[PDB]
Short mmCIF file of C-alpha atoms and ligand atoms in Angstrom, two decimals:
data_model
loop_
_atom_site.label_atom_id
_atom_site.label_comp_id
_atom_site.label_asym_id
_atom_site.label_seq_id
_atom_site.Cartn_x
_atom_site.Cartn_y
_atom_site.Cartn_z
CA UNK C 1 -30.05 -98.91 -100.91
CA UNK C 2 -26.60 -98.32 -102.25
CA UNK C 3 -23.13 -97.94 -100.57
CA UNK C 4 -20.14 -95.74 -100.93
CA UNK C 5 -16.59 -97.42 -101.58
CA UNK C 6 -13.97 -97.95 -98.15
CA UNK C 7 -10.35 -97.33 -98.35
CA UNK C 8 -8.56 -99.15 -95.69
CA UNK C 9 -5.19 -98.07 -94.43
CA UNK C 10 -2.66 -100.54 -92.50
CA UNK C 11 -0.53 -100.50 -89.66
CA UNK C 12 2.72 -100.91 -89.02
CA UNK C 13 4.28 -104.01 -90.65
CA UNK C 14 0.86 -104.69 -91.99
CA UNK C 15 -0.90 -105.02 -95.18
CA UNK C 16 -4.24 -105.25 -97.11
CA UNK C 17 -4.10 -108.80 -94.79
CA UNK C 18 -5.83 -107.31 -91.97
CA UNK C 19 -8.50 -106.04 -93.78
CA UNK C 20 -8.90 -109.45 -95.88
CA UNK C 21 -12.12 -110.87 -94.23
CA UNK C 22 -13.65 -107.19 -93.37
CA UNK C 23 -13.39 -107.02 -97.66
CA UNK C 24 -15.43 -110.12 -97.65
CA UNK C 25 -17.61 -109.39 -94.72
CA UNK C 26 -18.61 -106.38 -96.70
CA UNK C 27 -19.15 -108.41 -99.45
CA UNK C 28 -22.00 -110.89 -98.49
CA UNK C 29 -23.97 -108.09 -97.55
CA UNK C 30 -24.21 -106.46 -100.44
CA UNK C 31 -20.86 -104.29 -101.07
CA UNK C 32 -19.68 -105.31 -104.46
CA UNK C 33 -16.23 -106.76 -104.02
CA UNK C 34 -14.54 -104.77 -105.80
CA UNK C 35 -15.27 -101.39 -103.60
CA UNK C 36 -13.19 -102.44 -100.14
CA UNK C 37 -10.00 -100.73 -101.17
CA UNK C 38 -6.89 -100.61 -99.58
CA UNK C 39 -4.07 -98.50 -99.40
CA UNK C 40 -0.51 -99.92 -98.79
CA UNK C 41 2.74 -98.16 -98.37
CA UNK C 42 5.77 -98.07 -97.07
CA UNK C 43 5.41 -98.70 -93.36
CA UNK C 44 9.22 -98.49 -92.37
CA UNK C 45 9.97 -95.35 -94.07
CA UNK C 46 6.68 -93.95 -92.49
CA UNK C 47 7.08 -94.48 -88.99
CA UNK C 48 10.84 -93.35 -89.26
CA UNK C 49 10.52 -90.40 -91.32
CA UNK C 50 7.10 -89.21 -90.72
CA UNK C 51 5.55 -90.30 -87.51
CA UNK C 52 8.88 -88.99 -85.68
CA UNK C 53 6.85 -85.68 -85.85
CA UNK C 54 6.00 -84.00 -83.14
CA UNK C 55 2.06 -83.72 -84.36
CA UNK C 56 1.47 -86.23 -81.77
CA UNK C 57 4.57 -85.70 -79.90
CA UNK C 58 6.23 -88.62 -81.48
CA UNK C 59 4.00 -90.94 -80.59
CA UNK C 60 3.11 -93.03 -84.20
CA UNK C 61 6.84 -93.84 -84.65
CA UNK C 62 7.23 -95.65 -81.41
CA UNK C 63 6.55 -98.80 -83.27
CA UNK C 64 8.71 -98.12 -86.54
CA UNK C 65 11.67 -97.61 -84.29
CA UNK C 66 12.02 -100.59 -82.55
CA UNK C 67 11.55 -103.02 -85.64
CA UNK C 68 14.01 -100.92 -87.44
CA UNK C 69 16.73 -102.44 -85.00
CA UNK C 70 17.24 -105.07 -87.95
CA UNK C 71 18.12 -102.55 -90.43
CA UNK C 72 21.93 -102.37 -91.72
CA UNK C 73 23.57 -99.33 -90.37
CA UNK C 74 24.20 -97.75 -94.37
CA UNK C 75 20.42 -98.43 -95.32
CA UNK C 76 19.05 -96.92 -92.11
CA UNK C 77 21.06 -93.85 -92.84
CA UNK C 78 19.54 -93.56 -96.66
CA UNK C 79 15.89 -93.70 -95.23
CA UNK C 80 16.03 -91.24 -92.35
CA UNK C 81 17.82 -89.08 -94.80
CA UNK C 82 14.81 -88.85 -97.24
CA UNK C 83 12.69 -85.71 -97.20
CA UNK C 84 10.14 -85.78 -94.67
CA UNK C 85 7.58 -83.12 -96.60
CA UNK C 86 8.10 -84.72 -100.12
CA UNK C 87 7.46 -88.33 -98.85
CA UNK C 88 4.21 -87.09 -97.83
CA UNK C 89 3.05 -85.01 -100.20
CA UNK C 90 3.87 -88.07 -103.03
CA UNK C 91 2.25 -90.63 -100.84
CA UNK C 92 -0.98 -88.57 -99.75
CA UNK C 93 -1.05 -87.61 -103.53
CA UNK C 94 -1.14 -91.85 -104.38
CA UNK C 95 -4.00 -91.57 -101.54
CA UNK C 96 -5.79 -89.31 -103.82
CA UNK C 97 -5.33 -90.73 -107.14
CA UNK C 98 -7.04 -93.77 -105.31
CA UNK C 99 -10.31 -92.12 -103.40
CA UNK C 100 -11.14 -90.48 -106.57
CA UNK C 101 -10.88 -94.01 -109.49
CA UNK C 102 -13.07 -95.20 -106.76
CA UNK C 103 -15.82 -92.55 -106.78
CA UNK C 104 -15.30 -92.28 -110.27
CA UNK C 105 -15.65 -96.08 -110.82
CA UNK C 106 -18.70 -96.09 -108.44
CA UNK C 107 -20.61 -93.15 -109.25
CA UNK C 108 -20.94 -91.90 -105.67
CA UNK C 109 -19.67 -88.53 -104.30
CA UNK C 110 -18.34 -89.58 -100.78
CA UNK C 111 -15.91 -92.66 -99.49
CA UNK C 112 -15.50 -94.15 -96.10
CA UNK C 113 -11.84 -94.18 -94.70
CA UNK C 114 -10.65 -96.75 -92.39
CA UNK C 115 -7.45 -96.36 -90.56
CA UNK C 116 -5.89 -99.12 -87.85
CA UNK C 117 -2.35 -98.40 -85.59
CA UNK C 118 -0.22 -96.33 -87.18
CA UNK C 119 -2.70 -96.57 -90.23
CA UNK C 120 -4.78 -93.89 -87.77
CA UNK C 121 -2.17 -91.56 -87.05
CA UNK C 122 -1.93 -91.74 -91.01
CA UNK C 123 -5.48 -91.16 -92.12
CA UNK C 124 -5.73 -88.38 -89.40
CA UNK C 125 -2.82 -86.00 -91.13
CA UNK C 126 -4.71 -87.13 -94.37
CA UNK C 127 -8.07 -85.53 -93.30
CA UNK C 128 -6.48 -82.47 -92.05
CA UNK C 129 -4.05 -81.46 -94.84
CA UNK C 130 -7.11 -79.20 -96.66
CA UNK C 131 -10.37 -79.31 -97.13
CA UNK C 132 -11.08 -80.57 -100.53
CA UNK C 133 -10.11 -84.00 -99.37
CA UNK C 134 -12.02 -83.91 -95.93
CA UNK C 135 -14.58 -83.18 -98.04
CA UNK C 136 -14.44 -86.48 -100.55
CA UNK C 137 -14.98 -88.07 -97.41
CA UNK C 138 -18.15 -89.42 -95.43
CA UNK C 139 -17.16 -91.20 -92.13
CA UNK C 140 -14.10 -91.82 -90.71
CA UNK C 141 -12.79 -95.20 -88.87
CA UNK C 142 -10.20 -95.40 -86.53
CA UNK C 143 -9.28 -98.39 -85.09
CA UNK C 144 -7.43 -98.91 -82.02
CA UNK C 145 -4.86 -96.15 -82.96
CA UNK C 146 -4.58 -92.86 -82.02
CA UNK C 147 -6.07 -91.50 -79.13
CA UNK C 148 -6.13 -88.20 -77.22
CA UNK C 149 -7.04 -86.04 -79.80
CA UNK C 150 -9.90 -84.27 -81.77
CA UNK C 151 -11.41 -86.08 -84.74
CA UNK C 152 -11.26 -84.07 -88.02
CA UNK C 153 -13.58 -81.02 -88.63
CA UNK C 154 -17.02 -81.87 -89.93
CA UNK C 155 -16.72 -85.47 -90.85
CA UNK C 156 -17.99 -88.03 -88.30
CA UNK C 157 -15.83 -89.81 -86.64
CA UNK C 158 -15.38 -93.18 -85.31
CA UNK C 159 -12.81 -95.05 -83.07
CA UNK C 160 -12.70 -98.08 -81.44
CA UNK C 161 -9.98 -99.42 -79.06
CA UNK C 162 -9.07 -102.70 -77.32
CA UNK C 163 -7.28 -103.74 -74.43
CA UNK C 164 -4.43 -101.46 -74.41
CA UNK C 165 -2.32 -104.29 -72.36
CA UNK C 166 -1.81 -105.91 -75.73
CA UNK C 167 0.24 -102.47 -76.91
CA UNK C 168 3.31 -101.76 -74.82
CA UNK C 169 4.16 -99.30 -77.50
CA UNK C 170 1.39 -96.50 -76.15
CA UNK C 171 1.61 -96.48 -72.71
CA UNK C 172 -0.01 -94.95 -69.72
CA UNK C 173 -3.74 -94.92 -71.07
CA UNK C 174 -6.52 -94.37 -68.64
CA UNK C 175 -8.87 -93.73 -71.26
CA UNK C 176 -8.56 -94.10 -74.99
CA UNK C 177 -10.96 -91.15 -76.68
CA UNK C 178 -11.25 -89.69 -79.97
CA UNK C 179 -12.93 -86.46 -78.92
CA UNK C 180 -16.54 -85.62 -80.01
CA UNK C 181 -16.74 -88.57 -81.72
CA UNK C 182 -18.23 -92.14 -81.35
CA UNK C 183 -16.31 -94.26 -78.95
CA UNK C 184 -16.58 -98.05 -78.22
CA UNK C 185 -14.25 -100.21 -76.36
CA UNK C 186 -13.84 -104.17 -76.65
CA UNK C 187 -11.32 -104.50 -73.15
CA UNK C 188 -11.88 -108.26 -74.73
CA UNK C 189 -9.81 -107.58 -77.64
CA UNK C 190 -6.22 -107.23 -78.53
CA UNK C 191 -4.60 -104.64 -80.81
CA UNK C 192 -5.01 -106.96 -84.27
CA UNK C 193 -7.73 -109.09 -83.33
CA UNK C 194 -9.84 -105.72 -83.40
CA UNK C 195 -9.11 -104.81 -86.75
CA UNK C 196 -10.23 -108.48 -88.61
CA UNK C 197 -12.74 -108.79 -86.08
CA UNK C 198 -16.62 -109.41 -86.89
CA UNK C 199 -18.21 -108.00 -83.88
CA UNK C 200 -15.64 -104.49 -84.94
CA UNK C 201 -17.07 -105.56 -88.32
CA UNK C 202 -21.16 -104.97 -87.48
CA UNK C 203 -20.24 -101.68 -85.53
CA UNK C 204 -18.63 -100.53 -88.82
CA UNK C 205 -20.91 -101.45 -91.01
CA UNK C 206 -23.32 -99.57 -88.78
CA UNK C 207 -21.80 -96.31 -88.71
CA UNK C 208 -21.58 -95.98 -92.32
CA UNK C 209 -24.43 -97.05 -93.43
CA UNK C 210 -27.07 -96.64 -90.91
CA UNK C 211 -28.30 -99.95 -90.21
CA UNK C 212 -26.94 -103.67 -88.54
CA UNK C 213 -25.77 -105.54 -91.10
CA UNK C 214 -27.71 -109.22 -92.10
CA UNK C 215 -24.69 -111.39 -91.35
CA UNK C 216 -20.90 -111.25 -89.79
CA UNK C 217 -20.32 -115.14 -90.66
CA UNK C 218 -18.02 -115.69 -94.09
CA UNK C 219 -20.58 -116.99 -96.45
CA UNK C 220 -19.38 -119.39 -98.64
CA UNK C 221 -20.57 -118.64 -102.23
CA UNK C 222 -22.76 -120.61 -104.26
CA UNK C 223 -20.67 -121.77 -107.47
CA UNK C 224 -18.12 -124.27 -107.82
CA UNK C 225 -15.07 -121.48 -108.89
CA UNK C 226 -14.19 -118.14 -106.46
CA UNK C 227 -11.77 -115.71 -107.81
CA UNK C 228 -8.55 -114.46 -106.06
CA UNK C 229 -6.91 -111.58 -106.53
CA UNK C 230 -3.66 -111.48 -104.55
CA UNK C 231 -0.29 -109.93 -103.88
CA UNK C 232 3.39 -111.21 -103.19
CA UNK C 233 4.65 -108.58 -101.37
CA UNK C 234 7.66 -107.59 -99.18
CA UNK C 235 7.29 -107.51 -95.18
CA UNK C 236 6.32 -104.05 -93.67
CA UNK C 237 7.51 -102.02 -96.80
CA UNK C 238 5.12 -103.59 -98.92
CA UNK C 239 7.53 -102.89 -102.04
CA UNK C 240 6.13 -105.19 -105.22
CA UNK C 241 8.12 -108.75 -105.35
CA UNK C 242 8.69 -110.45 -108.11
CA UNK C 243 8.72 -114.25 -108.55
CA UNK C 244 7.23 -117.61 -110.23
CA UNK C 245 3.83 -119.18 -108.36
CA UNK C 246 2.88 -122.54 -108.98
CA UNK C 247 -0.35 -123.93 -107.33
CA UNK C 248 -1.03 -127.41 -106.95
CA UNK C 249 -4.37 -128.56 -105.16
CA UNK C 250 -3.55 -131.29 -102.18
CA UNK C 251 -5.68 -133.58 -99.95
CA UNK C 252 -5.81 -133.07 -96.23
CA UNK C 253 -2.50 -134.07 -95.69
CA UNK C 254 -0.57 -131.63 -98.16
CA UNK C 255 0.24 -134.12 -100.60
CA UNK C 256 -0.19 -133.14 -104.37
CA UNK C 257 -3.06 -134.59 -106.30
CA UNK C 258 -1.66 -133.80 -109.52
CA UNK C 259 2.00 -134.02 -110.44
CA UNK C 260 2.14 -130.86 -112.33
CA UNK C 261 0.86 -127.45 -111.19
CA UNK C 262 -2.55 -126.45 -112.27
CA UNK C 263 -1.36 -122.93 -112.46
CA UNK C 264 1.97 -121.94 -112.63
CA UNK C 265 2.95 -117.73 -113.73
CA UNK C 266 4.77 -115.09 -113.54
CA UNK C 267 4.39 -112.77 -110.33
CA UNK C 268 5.57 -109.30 -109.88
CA UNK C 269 3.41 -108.15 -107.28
CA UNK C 270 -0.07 -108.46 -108.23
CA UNK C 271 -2.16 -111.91 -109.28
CA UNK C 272 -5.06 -113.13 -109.98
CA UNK C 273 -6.92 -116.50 -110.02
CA UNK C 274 -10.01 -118.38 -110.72
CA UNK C 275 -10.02 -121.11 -107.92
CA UNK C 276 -12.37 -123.92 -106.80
CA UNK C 277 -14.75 -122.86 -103.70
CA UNK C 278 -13.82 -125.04 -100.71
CA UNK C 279 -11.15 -126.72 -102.06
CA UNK C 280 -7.61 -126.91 -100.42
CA UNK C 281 -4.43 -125.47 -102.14
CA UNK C 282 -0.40 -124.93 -101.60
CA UNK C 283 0.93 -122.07 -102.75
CA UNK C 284 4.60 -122.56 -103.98
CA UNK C 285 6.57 -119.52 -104.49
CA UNK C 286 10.04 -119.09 -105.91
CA UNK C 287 11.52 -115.51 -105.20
CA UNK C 288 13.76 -114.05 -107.23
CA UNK C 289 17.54 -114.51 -106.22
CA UNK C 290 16.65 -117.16 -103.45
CA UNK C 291 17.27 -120.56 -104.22
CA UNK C 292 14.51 -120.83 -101.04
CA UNK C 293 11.30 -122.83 -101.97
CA UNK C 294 8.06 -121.11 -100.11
CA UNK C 295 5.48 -122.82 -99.29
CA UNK C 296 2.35 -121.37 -98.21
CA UNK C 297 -0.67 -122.76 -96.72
CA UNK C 298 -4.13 -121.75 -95.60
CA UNK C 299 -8.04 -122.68 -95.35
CA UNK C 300 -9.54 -122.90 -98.47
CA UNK C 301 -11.72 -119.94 -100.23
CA UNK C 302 -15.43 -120.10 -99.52
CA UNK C 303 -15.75 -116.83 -101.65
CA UNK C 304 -14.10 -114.15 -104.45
CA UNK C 305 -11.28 -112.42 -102.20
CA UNK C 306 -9.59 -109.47 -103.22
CA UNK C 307 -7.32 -108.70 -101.09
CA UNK C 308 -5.08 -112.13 -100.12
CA UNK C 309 -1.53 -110.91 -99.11
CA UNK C 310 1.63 -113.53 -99.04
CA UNK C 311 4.52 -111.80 -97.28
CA UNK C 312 8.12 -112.44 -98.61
CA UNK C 313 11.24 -111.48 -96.82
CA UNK C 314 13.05 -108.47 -98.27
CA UNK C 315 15.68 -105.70 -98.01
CA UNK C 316 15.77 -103.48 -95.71
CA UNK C 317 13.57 -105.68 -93.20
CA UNK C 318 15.17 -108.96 -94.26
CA UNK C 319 13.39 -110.37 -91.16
CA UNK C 320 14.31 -114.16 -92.76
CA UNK C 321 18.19 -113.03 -91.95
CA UNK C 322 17.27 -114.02 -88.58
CA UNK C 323 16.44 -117.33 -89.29
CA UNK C 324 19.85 -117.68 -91.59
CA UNK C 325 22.44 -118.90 -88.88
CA UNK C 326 20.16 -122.10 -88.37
CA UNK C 327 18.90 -122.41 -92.19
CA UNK C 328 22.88 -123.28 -93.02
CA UNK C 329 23.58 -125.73 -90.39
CA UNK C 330 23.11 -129.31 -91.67
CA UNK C 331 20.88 -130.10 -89.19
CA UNK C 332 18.36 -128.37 -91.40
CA UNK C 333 18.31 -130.87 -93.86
CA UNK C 334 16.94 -132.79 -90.65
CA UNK C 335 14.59 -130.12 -89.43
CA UNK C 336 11.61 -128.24 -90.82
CA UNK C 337 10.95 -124.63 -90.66
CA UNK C 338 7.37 -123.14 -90.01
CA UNK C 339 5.81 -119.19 -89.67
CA UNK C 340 2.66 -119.33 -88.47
CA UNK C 341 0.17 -116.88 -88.78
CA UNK C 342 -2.71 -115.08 -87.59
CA UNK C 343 -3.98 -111.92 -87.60
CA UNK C 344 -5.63 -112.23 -84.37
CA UNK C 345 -3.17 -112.20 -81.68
CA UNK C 346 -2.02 -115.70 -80.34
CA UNK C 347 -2.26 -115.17 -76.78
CA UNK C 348 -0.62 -118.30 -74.26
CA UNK C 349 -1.87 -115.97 -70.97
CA UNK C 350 -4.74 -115.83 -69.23
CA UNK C 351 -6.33 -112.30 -68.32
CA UNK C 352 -9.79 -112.12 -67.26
CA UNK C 353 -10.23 -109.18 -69.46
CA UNK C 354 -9.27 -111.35 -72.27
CA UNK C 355 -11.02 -114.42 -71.50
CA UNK C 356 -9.09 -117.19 -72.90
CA UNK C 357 -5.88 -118.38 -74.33
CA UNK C 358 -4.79 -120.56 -77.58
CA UNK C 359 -2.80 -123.51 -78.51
CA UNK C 360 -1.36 -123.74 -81.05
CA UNK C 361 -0.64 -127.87 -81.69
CA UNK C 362 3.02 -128.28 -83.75
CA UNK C 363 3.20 -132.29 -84.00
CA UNK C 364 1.20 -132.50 -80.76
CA UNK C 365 3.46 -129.83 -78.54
CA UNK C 366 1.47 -126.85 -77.53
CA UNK C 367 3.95 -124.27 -78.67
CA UNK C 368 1.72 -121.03 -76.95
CA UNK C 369 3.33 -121.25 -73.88
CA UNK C 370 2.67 -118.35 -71.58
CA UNK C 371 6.73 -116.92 -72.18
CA UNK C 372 6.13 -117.33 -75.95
CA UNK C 373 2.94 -115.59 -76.55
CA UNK C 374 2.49 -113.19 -73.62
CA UNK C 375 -0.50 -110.57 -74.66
CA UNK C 376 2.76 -107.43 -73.90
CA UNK C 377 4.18 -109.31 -77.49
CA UNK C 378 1.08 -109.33 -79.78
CA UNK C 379 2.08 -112.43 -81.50
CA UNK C 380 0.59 -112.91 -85.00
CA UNK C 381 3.44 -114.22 -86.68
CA UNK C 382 5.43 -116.78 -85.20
CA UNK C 383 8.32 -119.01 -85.90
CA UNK C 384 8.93 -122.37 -85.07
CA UNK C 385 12.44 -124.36 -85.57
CA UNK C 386 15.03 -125.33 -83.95
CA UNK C 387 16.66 -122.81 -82.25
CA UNK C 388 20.57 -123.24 -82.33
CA UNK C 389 19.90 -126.54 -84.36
CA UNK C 390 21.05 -128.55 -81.48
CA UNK C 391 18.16 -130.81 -82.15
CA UNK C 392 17.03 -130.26 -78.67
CA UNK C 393 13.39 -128.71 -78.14
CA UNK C 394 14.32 -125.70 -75.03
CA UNK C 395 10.58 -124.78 -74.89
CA UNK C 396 11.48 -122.52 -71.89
CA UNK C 397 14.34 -120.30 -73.43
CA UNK C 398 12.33 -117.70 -74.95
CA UNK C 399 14.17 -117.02 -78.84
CA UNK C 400 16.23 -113.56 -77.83
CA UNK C 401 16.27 -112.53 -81.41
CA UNK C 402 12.55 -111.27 -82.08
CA UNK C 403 12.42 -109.77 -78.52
CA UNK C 404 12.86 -106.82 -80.35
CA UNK C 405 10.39 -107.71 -83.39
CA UNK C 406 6.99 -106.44 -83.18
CA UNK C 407 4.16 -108.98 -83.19
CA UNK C 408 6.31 -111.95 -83.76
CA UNK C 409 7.94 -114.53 -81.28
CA UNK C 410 9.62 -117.96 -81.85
CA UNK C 411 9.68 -121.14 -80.55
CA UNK C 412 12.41 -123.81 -80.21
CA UNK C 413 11.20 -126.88 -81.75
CA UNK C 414 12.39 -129.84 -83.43
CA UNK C 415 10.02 -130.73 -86.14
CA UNK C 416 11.16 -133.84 -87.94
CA UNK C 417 11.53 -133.51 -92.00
CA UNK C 418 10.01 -136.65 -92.20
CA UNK C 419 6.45 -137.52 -93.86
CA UNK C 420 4.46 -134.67 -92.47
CA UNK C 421 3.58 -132.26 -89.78
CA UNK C 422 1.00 -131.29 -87.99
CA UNK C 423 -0.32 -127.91 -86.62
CA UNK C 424 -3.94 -128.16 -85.02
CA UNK C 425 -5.32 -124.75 -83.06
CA UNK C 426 -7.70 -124.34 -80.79
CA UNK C 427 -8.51 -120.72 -80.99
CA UNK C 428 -9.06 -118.23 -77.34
CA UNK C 429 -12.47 -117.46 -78.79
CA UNK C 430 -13.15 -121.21 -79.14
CA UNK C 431 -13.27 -123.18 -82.51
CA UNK C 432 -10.80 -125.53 -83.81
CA UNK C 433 -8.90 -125.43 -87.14
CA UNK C 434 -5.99 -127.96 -88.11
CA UNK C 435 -3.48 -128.51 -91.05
CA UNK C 436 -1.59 -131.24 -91.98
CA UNK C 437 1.20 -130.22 -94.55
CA UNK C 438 4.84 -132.42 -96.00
CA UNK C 439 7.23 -131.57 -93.66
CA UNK C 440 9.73 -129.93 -95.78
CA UNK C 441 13.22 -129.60 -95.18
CA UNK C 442 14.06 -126.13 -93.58
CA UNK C 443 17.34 -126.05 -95.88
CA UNK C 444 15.45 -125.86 -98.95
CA UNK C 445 12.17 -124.72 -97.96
CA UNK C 446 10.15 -122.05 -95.72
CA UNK C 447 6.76 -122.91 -95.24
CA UNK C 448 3.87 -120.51 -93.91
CA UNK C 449 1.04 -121.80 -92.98
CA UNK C 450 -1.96 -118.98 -92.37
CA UNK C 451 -5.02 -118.96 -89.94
CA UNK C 452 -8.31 -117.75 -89.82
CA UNK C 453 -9.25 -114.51 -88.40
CA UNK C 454 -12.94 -116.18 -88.47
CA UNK C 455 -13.72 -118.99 -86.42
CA UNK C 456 -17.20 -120.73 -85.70
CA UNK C 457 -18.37 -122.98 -83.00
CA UNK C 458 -21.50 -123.81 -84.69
CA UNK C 459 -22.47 -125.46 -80.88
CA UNK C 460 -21.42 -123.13 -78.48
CL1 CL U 1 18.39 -116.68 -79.51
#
């Protein structure tokens, strides 16, 4: 049997991220690694100077409009001043120049496009700009996007949406359909979770191929040495950023096992890496013109993935501005700054629908209250310090400042800089996972620490 190469378009404010364990869910059954490819582009200039069309009645910007909020008044002005036609034909022309090195690197005729959020309302314009490229296609995935229109002529169509509760952004929804095409619902799943999700995984794998796939469980590798092939990138515009990565391998309670680095290079953008299956690793990052010391955490690599995303904080989305009042206090030489994330909405209230809720364990305080994580907010990135650097912990006083933020929230929290911390989560969809990092000093360092899409319970 042989399969036909996927292209995988983000969201807004996403990345090549939320299609990071789909890549390697692919993988394991067969899909060589190297044919989940994904396209990333400017998200912010998209939903502000595309998706303000009225193709859908406005309906795809929604999203870009209120995260552009942070944008400085003079920068705001250049974007929405760039041509709207020319922005699109350069970007869907990038879109081509990729579909066709993959065909031609794979020998087949027709791809499989996947398209999530805004990512949708993107592929859809794609499909329908002529026929030569609805023809380089075989199926077409849309995932928890648009809605209330007819799938592209000819080429089968797929769509699957999740609770729209988790989506303020959309609205009045009785019913979320693609018409004519192939329609399934998870009302169990929120807006994210969908698009990293295994059991969205099997149904995709299914409608492209023809058949349920052997396994939806990340298969660790046999081998002692995976290979990573990542990308330091900035936040929702996705722009290249350049920078020095050191990697040092630590124990489970972040502390170096070798004084030096066992990889240290030169970063502009793109990477790549041969590391040790199973074994756990800090990422240190130095940006440059930040005197800020990143450092990022995760759970180890059980197998080759191509498509590992670390998010830095740049212009015109400087979402880390935010943070700025409180990173130049000296109590942050006292405190310790943490982003935690997951893409997989972090949900702290109940809703049959749903199921469940998380916790989310900073130095034993559950910090996924029910008026931090409400499902309305999405969460999958979320910031814990303390808020005002008072020192004091208001748990209660939601952080006003990423109200406007999409999928993001904070937390007021005093995290001592002092030996380590902690951050233990028991995930909605049950299974544990738990990290134990150096709690560094949120005046000279940012750390992120990522979770799991994937999460077994191997007994229940
Ligand atoms: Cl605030």
């Amino acid at each position: 049997e042989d399969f036909r190469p996927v292209v995988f378009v983000h969201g807004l404010a996403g990345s090549a991220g939320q299609f990071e364990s789909q890549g390697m869910r692919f993988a394991a059954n067969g899909y060589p690694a190297e044919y989940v490819k994904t396209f990333e582009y400017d998200t912010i200039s998209w939903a502000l100077v595309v998706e303000t069309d009225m193709l859908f009645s406005g309906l795809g910007s929604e999203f870009g409009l209120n995260i552009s909020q942070i944008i400085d008044p003079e920068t705001l002005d250049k974007i929405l001043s760039k041509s709207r036609e020319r922005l699109i034909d350069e970007t869907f022309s990038r879109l081509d120049r990729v579909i066709d090195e993959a065909l031609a690197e794979s020998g087949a005729d027709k791809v499989d496009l996947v398209g999530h959020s805004m990512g949708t309302f993107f592929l859809v314009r794609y499909v329908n700009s002529s026929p030569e490229r609805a023809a380089k296609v075989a199926h077409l995935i849309l995932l928890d996007g648009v809605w209330g229109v007819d799938a592209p002529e000819g080429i089968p169509t797929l769509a699957v949406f999740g609770n729209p509760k988790a989506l303020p952004a959309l609205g009045l929804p009785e019913e979320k359909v693609v018409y004519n095409a192939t329609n399934v619902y998870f009302n169990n799943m929120t807006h994210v979770q969908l698009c990293t999700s295994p059991e969205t995984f099997a149904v995709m794998f299914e409608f492209i191929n023809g058949y349920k796939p052997a396994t939806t469980d990340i298969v660790p590798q046999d081998g002692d040495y995976v290979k990573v092939k990542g990308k330091f990138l900035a936040f929702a515009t996705n722009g290249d950023v350049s920078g020095w990565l050191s990697i040092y391998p630590i124990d489970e309670n972040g502390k170096r096992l070798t004084r030096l680095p066992v990889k240290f290079m030169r970063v502009k953008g793109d990477f790549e890496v041969r590391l040790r299956k199973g074994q756990l690793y800090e990422f240190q990052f130095r940006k440059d013109f930040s005197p800020i010391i990143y450092h990022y955490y995760r759970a180890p690599f059980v197998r080759d993935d191509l498509w590992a995303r670390f998010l830095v904080s740049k212009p015109p989305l400087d979402v880390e501005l935010l943070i700025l009042p409180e990173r130049l206090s000296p109590a942050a030489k006292e405190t310790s700054g943490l982003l935690l994330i997951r893409y997989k909405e972090m949900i702290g209230e109940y809703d049959e629908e749903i199921g469940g809720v998380d916790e989310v364990y900073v130095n034993g305080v559950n910090v996924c209250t029910e008026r931090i994580c409400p499902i309305e907010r999405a969460v999958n990135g979320l910031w814990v310090f303390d808020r005002g650097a008072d020192g004091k912990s208001d748990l209660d006083r939601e952080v006003v400042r990423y109200s406007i933020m999409p999928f993001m929230s904070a937390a007021d929290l005093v995290v001592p800089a002092e030996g380590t911390i902690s951050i233990a989560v028991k995930s909605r969809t049950g299974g544990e996972e738990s990290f134990t990092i150096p709690a560094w000093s949120a005046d000279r360092h940012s750390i992120i620490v990522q979770f799991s899409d994937y999460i077994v319970d191997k007994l229940a």
